[PDB]
């Protein structure tokens, strides 16, 4: 069995990565310019984009890639590091509102995870939690078009 989403970690931070189009993407604010561990040694990022908070390495072993969305649906579904799914309604190119706000912790450690459309296709990578008094009501993300362009 292969996973499209991998739970990654650094010496100080744990978050997620998502394989899309053969690349293992994640958020620069978590990975930095780090190499990804491999049973043959460190593997370097294929892409590093500080501006977009995006970095990607070749997809690791035990993974399978996700297909980008092509239906332009605005009904998104965020998957957390605990496998929970959170319905998010898109509000724009890179922002969505949780249908049911949740404690910030509920979303902690999940940046880098996928924002899926009704078909399970990648809409974007969860970038950051937009919260008020500790309650995450919205989500910030990196649309797949960015990943796609970055791969060029």
């Amino acid at each position: 069995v292969e996973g499209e989403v991998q739970i990654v970690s650094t010496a100080t931070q744990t978050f997620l990565a998502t394989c899309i189009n053969g690349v293992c993407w994640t958020v620069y604010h978590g990975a930095g310019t780090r190499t990804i561990a491999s049973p043959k040694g460190p593997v370097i990022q294929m892409y590093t984009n500080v501006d977009q908070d995006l970095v990607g390495w070749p997809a690791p072993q035990g993974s399978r890639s996700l297909t980008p969305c092509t239906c332009g649906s605005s009904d998104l579904y965020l998957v957390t590091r605990h496998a929970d799914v959170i319905p998010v309604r898109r509000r724009g190119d890179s922002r969505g509102s949780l249908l049911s706000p949740r404690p910030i912790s509920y979303l902690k450690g999940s940046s880098g995870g996928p924002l899926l459309c009704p078909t399970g296709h990648a809409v974007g990578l969860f970038r950051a939690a937009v919260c008020t008094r500790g309650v995450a009501k919205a989500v910030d993300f990196i649309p797949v078009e960015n990943l796609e362009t970055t791969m060029r």
């Binding site: 069995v1 292969e2 996973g3 499209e4 989403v5 991998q6 739970i7 990654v8 970690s9 650094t10 010496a11 744990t14 997620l16 990565a17 994640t26 990975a31 780090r34 190499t35 990804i36 561990a37 460190p42 690791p60 035990g62 993974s63 996700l66 998957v79 590091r81 496998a83 996928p114 899926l116 399970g120």
Partner: peptide
């Protein structure tokens, strides 16, 4: 340092 994979998630819920 380096980023290490400590786990994985299968979207379809596929069991081994």
């Amino acid at each position: 340092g380096s980023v290490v994979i400590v786990g994985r998630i299968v979207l379809s819920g596929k069991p081994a």
